[PDB]
Amino acid sequence: SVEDDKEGHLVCRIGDWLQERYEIVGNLGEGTFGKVVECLDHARGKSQVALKIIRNVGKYREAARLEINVLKKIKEKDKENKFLCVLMSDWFNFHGHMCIAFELLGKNTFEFLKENNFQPYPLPHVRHMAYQLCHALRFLHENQLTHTDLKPENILFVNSEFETLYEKSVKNTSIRVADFGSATFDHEHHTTIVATRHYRPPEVILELGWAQPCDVWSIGCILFEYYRGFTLFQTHENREHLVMMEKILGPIPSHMIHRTRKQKYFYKGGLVWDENSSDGRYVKENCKPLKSYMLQDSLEHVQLFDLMRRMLEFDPAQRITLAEALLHPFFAGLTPEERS
Ligand SMILES: Cn1c2c(c3ccc(Cl)c(Cl)c31)[C@H](C#N)C1(CCNCC1)NC2=O
Numbered sequence: 001s002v003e004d005d006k007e008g009h010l011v012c013r014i015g016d017w018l019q020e021r022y023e024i025v026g027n028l029g030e031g032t033f034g035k036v037v038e039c040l041d042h043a044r045g046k047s048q049v050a051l052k053i054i055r056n057v058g059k060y061r062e063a064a065r066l067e068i069n070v071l072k073k074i075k076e077k078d079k080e081n082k083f084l085c086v087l088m089s090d091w092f093n094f095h096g097h098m099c100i101a102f103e104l105l106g107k108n109t110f111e112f113l114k115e116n117n118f119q120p121y122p123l124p125h126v127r128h129m130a131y132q133l134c135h136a137l138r139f140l141h142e143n144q145l146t147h148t149d150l151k152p153e154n155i156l157f158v159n160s161e162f163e164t165l166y167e168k169s170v171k172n173t174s175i176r177v178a179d180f181g182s183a184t185f186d187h188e189h190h191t192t193i194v195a196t197r198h199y200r201p202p203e204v205i206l207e208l209g210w211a212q213p214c215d216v217w218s219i220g221c222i223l224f225e226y227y228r229g230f231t232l233f234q235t236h237e238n239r240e241h242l243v244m245m246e247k248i249l250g251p252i253p254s255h256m257i258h259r260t261r262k263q264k265y266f267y268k269g270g271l272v273w274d275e276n277s278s279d280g281r282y283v284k285e286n287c288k289p290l291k292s293y294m295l296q297d298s299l300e301h302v303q304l305f306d307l308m309r310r311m312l313e314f315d316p317a318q319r320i321t322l323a324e325a326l327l328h329p330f331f332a333g334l335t336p337e338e339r340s
Pocket of ligand 1: 028029036050052086102103104105106107108153156
């Protein structure tokens, strides 16, 4: 009544069941880890879930068990569900397949941006999404947890039904934070390489140790991307990425240069970088001081850029915390509806 293919995926398709409770009604994508299927939960109101079905492969089974354990601790600290994390509704071991059920939500903030032709979110939408992202991660950070992999693809709209205006505009900017697979408690082993390239802070690139400030850097990057529709750091190499940071944000703190094992990036305390090369000319022409990317010069825009610069502080010990970010004057622009 159950089988696996040669990769250890669960053989299944639309119409199948699990646990005499989940009825598979759609495909939501695959990965190295296994499958995600849209299911009706017949033990709820035939309510829609995303069900992640992990391969019958040791290393994926164990990675899923650690993710479940994280999701269980978040749940215990947020019973009331106030801090805007994607809801884990159930989990089970199905013949060696770890299965995790989540509340089905709408498009991720990246898919929505792509489908609007990368035309940026209006500032009031950036502000509401920023506020929820700060609120969600502040709660995790105060419970000794770092996400480590915040990116637009991991931030979901609760409903992504949009109005078309003379541009697509999402009707409701309520979001949830997903993908706790890499989340790390203060007392746990911190792996060396965290965050996706574009969202990765200097203290991770220089391997100087990381903690909650890692997520604040990622959020600064994400807010830039919501505001302009393109990524702040478009590079796949550490030495170029640090040069881009310097051109956009100012000089790297000399104590971070002194402490890094990666001395090869530096000569007499300066980044090794040939301004005259092809790559040199490209970075010169495309990576300007952060303020030069504002679209308007009214207060609301100035306030976003001031908050964003404090989220992109090189030194993680000087970087704004999310408890501080939530008091920033940028958030006075929220409606009384958004602010709760
Ligand atoms: C909860 N959820 C959702 C998606 C997932 C894709 C993969 C995984 Cl592992 C999960 Cl949990 C997903 C998709 C994205 N991003 C969609 C699937 C339904 N249509 C909109 C995107 N929404 C989710 O709630």
